[PDB]
Design a protein that fits this description.
The structure is cut from a larger assembly and holds 8 protein chains of 8 kinds.
Chain A: no helix or strand
Chain B: H1 11-29, H2 33-48, H3 56-73, H4 108-111, H5 115-129, H6 133-140
Helix pairs in contact in B: 1-2, 1-3
Chain F: H1 23-47, H2 59-69, H3 82-114
The chains are: A little secondary structure (11), B mainly alpha (176), C mainly alpha (99), D mainly alpha (168), E mainly alpha (606), F mainly alpha (125), G mainly alpha (459), H mainly alpha (50).
Bound molecules: cardiolipin (2 copies) and 1,2-Distearoyl-sn-glycerophosphoethanolamine (3PE) (3 copies).
One cardiolipin (CDL) sits between chains E (16, 19, 22-23, 78, 116, 119, 123, 126-127, 130, 139, 142, 146, 149) and G (353-354, 357, 360, 371, 442, 445).
Chain lengths: 11, 176, 99, 168, 606, 125, 459, 50
């Protein structure tokens, strides 16, 4: 299992 | 996608690339493997018939004629592997290839998960603000003062120094 | 050359105010400004504006007109009259010039 | 809904003649619908009509006294021209609604008759053509800035030609 | 009249619900794909009922739901015309989108925005249902443009690919070119009839109505694919196989034909429209099948075959058989969706390769999709009873039984043979030869979300023609009186095409090199229509936009003329009048000239 | 044989400029590559450089926009074929369309005046 | 009306004697309350119009302009906030006061009854715009831009004043609806033709004709975002209001003294929609879009039909909202990248996945996606011009095509490629600007649901 | 607290001043109060219509 880079999306 | 073309291709490279393209279009034309092997052996015989020749003028002439024959006998709908230019997957995951700096704007409550991940990302920077100054000198000092220059890069000659201009070849996203 | 300050540098805001909202650096002021915006533009104007406008009655008589048109069609079709004539004004009261 | 304004002719529905022995879903499906959709919604509308009945209210259709027309309205006196122009706009809007009623009366007949609209939908088409002729004679080429005075000028520019035709 | 209308609007409420959960916060705590699929399932089960009540009574309804505006004797409102066409197309399209949603939940795993994908699919479905059930040209235009924009959003899913975007903009361009004619028709009707509703418009059967029909014909050429505006459909294969199956095999392309059947009451008396139909639709059956004989991509082959079938439907429209055209619209979706379905199965099984020249032995390494592909191919060719017959046989009988154009009557059949030709090509290069694909093998087609949808669409492709043709009403009398060489022509010529293809494909062996030829080069490069048009027209348009308007007119001449001239004039007069040196002698000589001029004015005029 | 065109250009294979081995060719190629590499090194000393908060500029893009936008009029010179292209592009089509519309309007108006037209159902305009 | 103007006048002290931390908040909240109160004008239960005084009046045509004017204010407040953030408290109070003065004068000139009051206000609208554009622009050609704007306007406006005096002398008043109940036909003489030219050129310049459009792109490209918004939304509408009000007395001259402008509009429509394909500056692209859209308004006023005027009003309001939205969208990026060049930044919709929707819907509107008021206007203008002459549909279709082209071009060269990964300064999206875009869009949904408030005088 | 919260009495005061000036304006223009050929009433339920 790996890590998918993504922007914030919280704002 | 890893090197840069030289200021000019040599006759050898030209002929090799012509051979490769001719064989790819032979594959396109001949759908079956037996036929492909048959005519590939025939083509390699046609090629080897003029391998021990050295007259550069006649060689260039043979090449200029073979390229025209290729343009006249080329398949117009050749086979292109999907992930390659002209293929049905070229630049398909660029939508998900998000860069690394997009995480410097994350919100504490987002990196609160994956905490063990972001700790490494930190010391990967410590490994960058230190390894930067000496990557310049290694270029300054390894410069050709006779004007000549090309798109090559040297490795590091020490224990601790890192290849100059690595951060972007490293750290780049998967292909998936 | 001449005397002048040097071009300034970009300035991330989230670094210091990860809860930034867009209005002011002061966090409490940022928050109260966004709150005032959301409560006066969305919660009131759009909502109560839409309500009032929707419950404005008979905008430009488009309803009374239909009612009265039904009344007229009934009256006329009942008394055998036609539903609409070709001359608005009765040509009796009018006095045309004689050439 | 006044059936005189909106005719809605009657419905010749025939007898179901099931010349077979295999059942028909539609019937039992309609019964299930009546039982599990109609009944409760009907009860709820009954409740709402109960609340209405116990707190009724009435509203009236406004009447508009008739005022002088443009004909008895001088050439520069505006206290009269205002009244007359408002009256004309009022009647123009009512005529819009009349024509819309005619068209809403024609579409229904077309849809009803279907393939017999070329033979059974003629009096409505005739009423439509007639009211169209009238609307055209009254309001066709006035313009964005239409008014009673332009309507009057149209009337007279029509009547003078009709008078010429009459005399010859 | 309560059950019918309720069942008609309930499907819309249902289709809307998912998009309502798409704005809520439940997405992250729901299985949106399964929920949407169940919504589509129940929408289909609901739409099944109106179909029964119609087949029984044959009653059509008009339903006005809401008053939008009243514009000075011109109302506009939401109006649904529930008729044969609408109620049948709704059921077909829902039954298909069900299968497509399931296969999409299978085929698009590993895509994070699968929720977005499903949302866009259902949005397109809603737009198409509007287009199909509209009782009003404005509502129909809403559906038109919604389809045209959902196409842009789905062709472009991979917005890093610099060719999917070209395809999207191509579709937008051609469909705007069609919207030109659509708006022309709307304008003509709004003026000459003060309406936009089919009902009033049906009272123009005696009027001339040639310009609006030309406009609608252009709009149909646009939304559908015909020789003038066709290329955007093949270039739509740049998008996922599910949208290639829905928006480009069964829906968004029968829209113009649906328009023309809805307006068949006016084409019945114009032998200039019917004659350009018959002489255009046939020009595509041939020109695309030809293109579908030397292409190597399954998706492109299927798209060209779709275009050919659409030309056939336009032909049977021109020959005055609208109900037959619509029956073909409806019996075509099943197999032209199952074909894309099996294509996408094969693809996702392999490493995302669509070129038939690198696959084979599918008949043995993948029995399910091979069987379904063969079933679809047979139904398409016209096998006596697999949903192809019940429309294509009647079409190909009327084509020769009517008084028609004797060149269309020929190229139509040549293309009807090229159908079996390229179908046999698919069968032979994908399911009969040796495995010329890579050596690593991870095939797996044992997932219900893939097995059940195709099983379902295959039951459809087998029995839909029967079930419909034996329930619909007889709105046209066919000709069962003719010679055997007309009654059996479709079957015979399909067989001959199969055999010719067998021969010419076995010739692919025999160790005889393939000397390129201009016929094959033409069929392969599309007749060069794209390669030349998409290079001249942009160049002219853009070199004009830049060198003429922006440069020559705006930034050069409209400046040189007005403002620069004003500035020059006033600066020059300024210099003149302010070139003064402080010389009292000269100032006073000027004063003296003034005195003289004034004295003279006075003594002269007096 | 392949006839090149300004829209289907000539490939690099059939270009006799390629296969040329003259020093006046190979030296020029080497110099071009040296310039390219100097620029790439300059740009990569900014891409991967830490302590960079802003983005990278493109003086070439700036030059291109400035040329296509603001360096036009300072170099404009009235000439023959220039005045003519301008006048034509500006006025010709307007005259064409004016006469089209005027003919149509006049025809319609004389028809209506004579009453020889059919305006059935036209009650909006 | 005074209940709308007095509070707008009081927003000034509030602004100046509010503390340096609550002025923005307070003035924005009260501006929203003003927008709310302005809806009294929509209580039109009869075909009679409103008349509060000898000096004020409202109509179904002036009410929507007024409400859009009172609505745009707090949006401009919010949008001019990130910039001039470091600038001094006094300077930003000056900015706010400029905005408020524009609001008040625009409300006045939309609610006016007399042409000369309309004139003094339509010409006083220059001071604040010029000051905003010259004192808060970032380039060095904003000065020339203000020169162009100011002087085009004044050169067009002088003969209008002279014509107004000539009328005030022939007739005894400049009052509207009296100029209507007393209007006479004319003699079709050259003096009256020049009267027509005078009355018209001011407005034909303030809404850019094709040949005198050389002040709008400048002003936009060089002006800040609030100036851009007001210029695109209302200052381009003053001309339309003025012509719709002054064309009632010029009969029957516009039947033949309008051809040149119809031609110029229908041609410059194409010749600007095409520039929208090969312009590099996003702001100038949107300016030429505004021009190509106002051409329709011009050509529709010229022909004087009810459907035409209806479409004119619908498209006026719709384009106002949409242009403001697009300008603010481009500004969101400018604030992050300091370059109006479009092809520079690309591959967004990856880091800004939501603003890519606002970008998309603002484009769906501009290219007239139904159901929308942009289209409910374009369609009726097209029908009116088709009744005028059937050959207009050609140019209308060409313009439609080019619009559908350049809208999606603007979309794709910014949001639908692959990213310029070398952009470290892409501060995530502010709630403030997301709210800007939402406040722009939602009213379009509501006016598409209830377009009875937007038809105009005729309907 | 007043020195920072007294600025909330201006804009509503302005709204009220505007309503008051409208009342003055319509206290003027009183003529034709019941002399309109369309709304001539008889003053039976009251003494002033408008
Ligand atoms: C004639 C027929 C009769 C019926 C007429 C119907 C109208 C005509 C129908 C034909 C229309 C043709 C055009 C169709 C294509 C339109 C293009 C499009 O779909 O844009 C993509 C758009 C956005 O999707 P996306 O691109 O994936 O973006 C997702 C983001 O990444 C973020 O994803 P997320 O996870 O955060 O999702 C949560 C969601 C969150 O959604 C929301 O928060 C919306 C707010 C709901 C308020 C609830 C309180 C009440 O946010 C969004 O997805 C969208 C954000 C932008 C907001 C969109 C607002 C649309 C306008 C709303 C108007 C408001 C009216 C009521 C206001 C009341 C005022 C008094 O699609 C939609 O989901 C919106 C649906 C619009 C369809 C309307 C037609 C219904 C039928
Ligand atoms: C056990 C089982 C129980 C279930 C039994 C059934 C339930 C029966 C029942 O509850 O009766 C209610 C009871 C029954 O009374 P009733 O017998 O029906 O009498 C009629 C009323 O007197 C009539 O009074 P009303 O006029 O106030 O009716 C409410 C009003 C509601 O609307 C309003 O005016 C006021 C509400 C505004 C919302 C403001 C808040 C915003 C914040 C959110 O209706 C509308 O105006 C409909 C507005 C349509 C909005 C959506 C339209 C989409 C159009 C898209 C545009 C594009 C079209 C293109 C077509 C192109 C074709 C050419 O009271 C009501 O009818 C009112 C219900 C309120 C429903 C509100 C929700 C409606 C959905 C739209 C608004 C969303 C908010
Ligand atoms: C005029 C001034 C112009 C200036 C603009 C700036 C405005 C700022 C002030 C804020 C807005 C104030 C109110 C705006 C108008 C609100 C209209 C309204 O209240 O809705 C009325 C409607 C019922 O209409 P009604 O007239 O009563 O009955 C006859 C049929 N219309 O009842 C309703 O429908 C209300 C329920 C709303 C539900 C919305 C559902 C959305 C449906 C999706 C439609 C999508 C269409 C657009 C898609 C393409 C757009 C790109
Ligand atoms: C906490 C936030 C508060 C915001 C308001 C919350 C409630 C929502 C209200 C919004 C809906 C209404 C919007 C339209 C208001 C316009 C109506 C109006 O103001 O009428 C004028 C009225 C003066 O009435 P007048 O006849 O002139 O004098 C008699 C004195 N008794 O004057 C009034 O009646 C005053 C109306 C107040 C407007 C605000
Ligand atoms: C870069 C551009 C150039 C800038 C420099 C501008 C130079 C100004 C031109 C020089 C002066 C020429 C105009 C002289 C005016 C003559 C008087 C006149 O035309 O008025 C006649 C008409 C009223 O006549 P009437 O009512 O029928 O009866 C007799 C009077 N009681 O009343 C009228 O018609 C009023 C006419 C006012 C003048 C109109 C000017 C032309 C209008 C169209 C163009 C406007 C744009 C600016 C001017 C451009 C150049 C003309």
């Amino acid at each position: 299992r790996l890590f998918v880079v993504k922007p914030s999306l919280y704002y | 996608a890893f090197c840069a073309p030289p200021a000019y291709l040599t006759h050898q490279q030209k002929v090799l690339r012509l051979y490769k393209r001719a064989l790819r279009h032979l594959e396109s034309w001949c759908i079956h493997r037996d036929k492909y092997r048959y005519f590939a052996c025939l083509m390699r015989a046609r090629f080897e018939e003029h391998k021990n020749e050295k007259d550069m003028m006649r060689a260039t002439q043979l090449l200029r004629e073979a390229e025209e024959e290729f343009w006249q006998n080329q398949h117009p709908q050749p086979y292109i592997f999907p992930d390659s230019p002209g293929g049905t997957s070229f630049e398909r995951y660029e939508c998900y290839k998000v860069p690394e700096w997009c995480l410097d704007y994350w919100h504490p409550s987002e990196k609160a998960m994956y905490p063990d991940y972001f700790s490494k990302r930190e010391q990967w920077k410590k490994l960058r603000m230190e390894s930067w100054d000496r990557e310049v000198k290694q270029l300054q000092e390894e410069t050709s003062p006779d004007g000549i220059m090309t798109e090559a890069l040297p490795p590091a000659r020490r224990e601790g120094d890192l290849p100059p201009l690595w951060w972007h070849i490293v750290t780049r996203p998967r292909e998936r | 050359q001449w005397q002048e300050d040097p071009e300034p540098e970009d300035e991330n805001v989230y670094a210091k105010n990860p809860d930034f909202h867009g209005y002011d650096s002061d966090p409490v002021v940022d928050v109260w400004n966004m709150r005032a915006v959301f409560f006066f533009g969305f919660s009131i104007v759009l909502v109560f504006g839409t309500t009032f406008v929707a419950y404005v009655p008979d905008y430009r008589m488009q309803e009374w007109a239909r009612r009265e048109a039904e009344r007229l069609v009934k009256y006329r079709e009942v008394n055998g009259l036609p539903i609409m004539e070709s001359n608005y004004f009765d040509p009796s009261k009018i006095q045309l010039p004689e050439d | 809904w006044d059936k005189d304004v909106y005719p809605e002719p009657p419905s010749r529905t025939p007898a179901p003649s099931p010349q077979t022995s295999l059942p028909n879903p539609i019937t039992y499906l309609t019964k299930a619908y009546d039982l599990v959709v109609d009944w409760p919604v009907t009860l709820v509308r009954e409740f709402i009509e109960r609340q209405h009945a116990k707190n009724r209210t009435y509203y009236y259709h406004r009447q508009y006294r008739r005022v002088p027309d443009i004909t008895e309205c001088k050439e520069g006196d505006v206290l009269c021209i205002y009244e007359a122009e408002m009256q004309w706009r009022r009647d123009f809007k009512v005529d819009q609604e009349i024509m819309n009623i005619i068209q809403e009366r024609l579409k229904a007949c077309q849809q009803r008759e279907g393939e017999n609209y070329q033979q059974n939908c003629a009096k409505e088409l005739e009423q439509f053509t007639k009211v169209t002729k009238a609307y055209q004679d009254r309001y066709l080429d006035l313009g964005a800035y239409y008014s009673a005075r332009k309507c009057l000028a149209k009337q007279k520019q029509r009547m003078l030609e009709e008078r010429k035709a009459a005399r010859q | 009249m309560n059950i019918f209308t309720t069942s008609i609007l309930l499907i819309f409420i249902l289709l809307l619900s998912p998009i309502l959960i798409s704005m809520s916060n439940l997405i992250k705590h729901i299985n949106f794909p399964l929920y949407t699929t169940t919504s589509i399932k129940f929408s289909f089960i609901i739409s099944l009922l109106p179909l029964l009540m119609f087949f029984h009574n044959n009653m059509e309804y008009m339903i006005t739901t809401w008053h939008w505006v009243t514009m000075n004797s011109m109302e506009l409102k939401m109006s649904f015309k529930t008729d044969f066409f609408s109620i049948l197309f709704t059921s077909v399209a829902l039954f298909v989108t069900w299968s497509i949603m399931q296969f999409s939940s299978w085929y698009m795993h590993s895509d994070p925005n699968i929720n977005r994908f499903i949302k866009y699919l259902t949005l397109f479905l809603i737009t198409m249902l509007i287009l199909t059930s509209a009782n009003n040209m404005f509502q129909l235009f809403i559906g038109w443009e919604g389809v045209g924009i959902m196409s842009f959003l789905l062709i472009g899913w991979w917005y890093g690919r610099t060719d999917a975007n070209t395809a999207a903009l191509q579709a937008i361009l051609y469909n705007r070119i069609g919207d030109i004619g659509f708006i022309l028709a709307m304008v003509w009707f709004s003026l000459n009839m003060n309406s936009w509703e089919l009902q009033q418009i049906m009272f123009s059967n005696n009027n001339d109505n040639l310009i609006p029909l030309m406009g609608l014909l252009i709009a149909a050429t646009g939304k559908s694919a015909q020789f003038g505006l066709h290329p955007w459909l093949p270039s739509a294969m740049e998008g996922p196989t599910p949208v290639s199956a829905l928006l480009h095999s069964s829906t968004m392309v029968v829209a113009g034909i649906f328009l023309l059947v809805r307006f068949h009451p006016l084409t019945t008396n114009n032998n200039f429209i019917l004659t350009t139909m018959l002489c255009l639709g046939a020009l595509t059956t041939l020109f695309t099948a030809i293109c579908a004989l030397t292409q190597n991509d399954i998706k492109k082959i299927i798209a060209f075959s779709t275009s050919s079938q659409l030309g056939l439907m336009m032909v049977t429209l021109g020959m005055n058989q609208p109900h037959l055209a619509f029956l073909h619209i409806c019996t075509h979706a099943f197999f032209k969706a199952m074909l894309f379905m099996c294509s996408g199965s094969i693809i996702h099984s392999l490493a995302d390769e669509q070129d038939i020249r690198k696959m084979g032995n599918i008949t043995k390494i993948m029995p399910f999709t091979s069987s379904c592909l063969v079933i679809g191919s047979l139904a398409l060719t016209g096998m006596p009873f697999l949903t192809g017959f019940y429309s294509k046989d009647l079409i190909i009988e009327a084509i020769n039984t009517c008084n028609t154009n004797a060149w269309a009557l020929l190229i139509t059949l040549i293309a009807t043979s090229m159908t079996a030709m390229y179908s046999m090509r698919i069968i032979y290069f994908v399911t009969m030869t040796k495995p010329r694909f890579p050596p690593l093998i991870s095939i797996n087609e044992n997932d219900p979300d893939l097995m059940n949808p195709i099983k379902r669409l295959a039951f459809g492709s087998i029995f839909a023609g029967f079930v419909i043709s034996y329930n619909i009403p007889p709105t046209s009398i066919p000709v069962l009186t003719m010679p055997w060489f007309l009654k059996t022509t479709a079957l015979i010529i399909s067989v001959l095409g199969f055999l010719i293809a067998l021969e010419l494909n076995n010739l692919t062996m025999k160790l005889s090199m393939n000397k390129a030829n201009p016929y094959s080069s033409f069929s392969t490069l599309l007749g060069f229509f794209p390669s030349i048009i998409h290079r001249i027209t942009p160049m002219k348009s853009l070199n004009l936009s830049l060198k003429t308007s922006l440069t020559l007119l705006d930034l050069i001449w409209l400046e040189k003329t007005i403002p620069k001239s004003t500035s020059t004039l006033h600066t020059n007069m300024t210099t003149l009048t302010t070139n003064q040196k402080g010389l009292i002698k000269l100032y006073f000589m000027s004063f003296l000239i003034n005195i003289i001029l004034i004295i003279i004015l006075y003594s002269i005029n007096l | 044989k392949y006839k090149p065109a300004p829209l289907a250009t000539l490939p690099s294979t059939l270009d006799p400029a390629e296969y040329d081995v003259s020093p006046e060719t190979r030296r020029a190629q080497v110099e071009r590559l040296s310039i390219r590499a100097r620029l790439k090194r300059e740009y990569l000393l900014q891409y991967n450089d830490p302590k960079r908060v802003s983005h990278i500029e493109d003086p070439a893009l700036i030059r291109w926009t400035y040329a296509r936008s603001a360096n036009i009029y300072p170099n404009f010179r009235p000439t023959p074929k220039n005045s003519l292209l301008g006048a034509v592009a500006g006025f010709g089509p307007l005259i064409f369309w004016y006469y089209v519309f005027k003919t149509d309007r006049d025809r319609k108006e004389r028809l209506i005046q004579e009453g020889k037209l059919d305006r059935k159902f036209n009650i909006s305009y | 009306m005074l209940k709308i103007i007095l509070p707008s006048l009081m927003l000034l002290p509030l602004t100046w004697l509010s503390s340096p931390k609550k002025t923005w908040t307070n003035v924005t909240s009260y501006s929203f309350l003003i927008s709310l109160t302005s809806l009294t004008l929509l209580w039109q239960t009869d075909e009679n119009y409103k008349n509060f005084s000898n000096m004020f009046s409202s109509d179904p045509l002036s009410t929507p302009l007024i409400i859009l004017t009172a609505w745009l204010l707090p949006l401009m407040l919010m949008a001019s906030q990130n910039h001039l953030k470091k600038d001094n408290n006094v300077l930003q109070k000056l900015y706010i006061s400029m905005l408020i003065s524009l609001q008040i004068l625009l409300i006045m000139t939309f609610s006016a009854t007399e042409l000369i009051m309309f004139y003094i206000l339509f010409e006083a609208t220059l001071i604040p715009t010029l000051i905003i554009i010259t004192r808060w622009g970032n380039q060095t050609e904003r000065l020339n831009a203000g020169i162009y704007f100011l002087f085009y306007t004044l050169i067009g406006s002088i003969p209008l004043l002279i014509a107004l005096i000539l009328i005030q002398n022939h007739v005894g008043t400049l009052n509207l609806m009296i100029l209507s109940f007393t209007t006479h036909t004319l003699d079709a003489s050259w003096s009256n033709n020049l009267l027509w030219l005078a009355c018209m050129m001011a407005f034909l310049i303030k809404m850019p004709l094709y040949g005198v459009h050389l002040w709008l792109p400048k002003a936009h490209v060089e002006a800040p975002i609030a100036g851009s918004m007001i210029l695109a939304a209302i200052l381009l509408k003053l001309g339309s209001y003025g012509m719709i009000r002054i064309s009632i007395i010029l009969d029957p001259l516009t039947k033949y003294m309008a051809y040149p402008f119809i031609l110029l509009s229908l041609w410059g429509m194409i010749m600007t929609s095409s520039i929208c394909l090969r312009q590099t500056d996003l702001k100038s692209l949107i300016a030429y879009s505004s021009v190509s859209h106002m051409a329709l308004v011009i050509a529709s006023i010229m022909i004087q039909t009810p459907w035409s005027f209806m479409g004119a009003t619908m498209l006026m309001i719709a384009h106002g909202l949409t242009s403001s939205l697009l300008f603010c969208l481009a500004n969101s990026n400018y604030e992050r990248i300091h370059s109006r060049t479009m092809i520079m930044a690309r591959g967004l919709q990856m880091v800004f996945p939501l603003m890519a929707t606002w970008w998309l819907m603002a484009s769906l509107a501009n290219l007239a996606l139904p159901p929308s008021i942009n289209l409910m206007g374009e369609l009726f203008i097209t029908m009116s011009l088709f009744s005028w002459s059937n050959f207009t549909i050609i140019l209308m279709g060409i313009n439609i095509i080019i619009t559908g082209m350049y809208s999606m071009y603007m979309i794709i060269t910014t949001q639908r490629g692959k990213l310029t990964n070398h952009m470290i300064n892409l501060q995530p999206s502010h709630t403030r600007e997301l709210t800007l875009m939402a406040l722009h869009m939602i009213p379009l949904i509501l006016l598409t649901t209830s377009p009875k408030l937007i038809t105009g005088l005729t309907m | 607290l007043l020195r920072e919260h007294w600025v909330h009495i201006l804009v509503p005061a302005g709204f009220v001043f505007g309503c008051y000036l409208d009342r003055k304006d319509d206290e003027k223009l009183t003529a034709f109060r019941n002399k309109s050929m369309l709304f001539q009433r008889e003053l039976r339920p009251n003494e002033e219509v408008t």
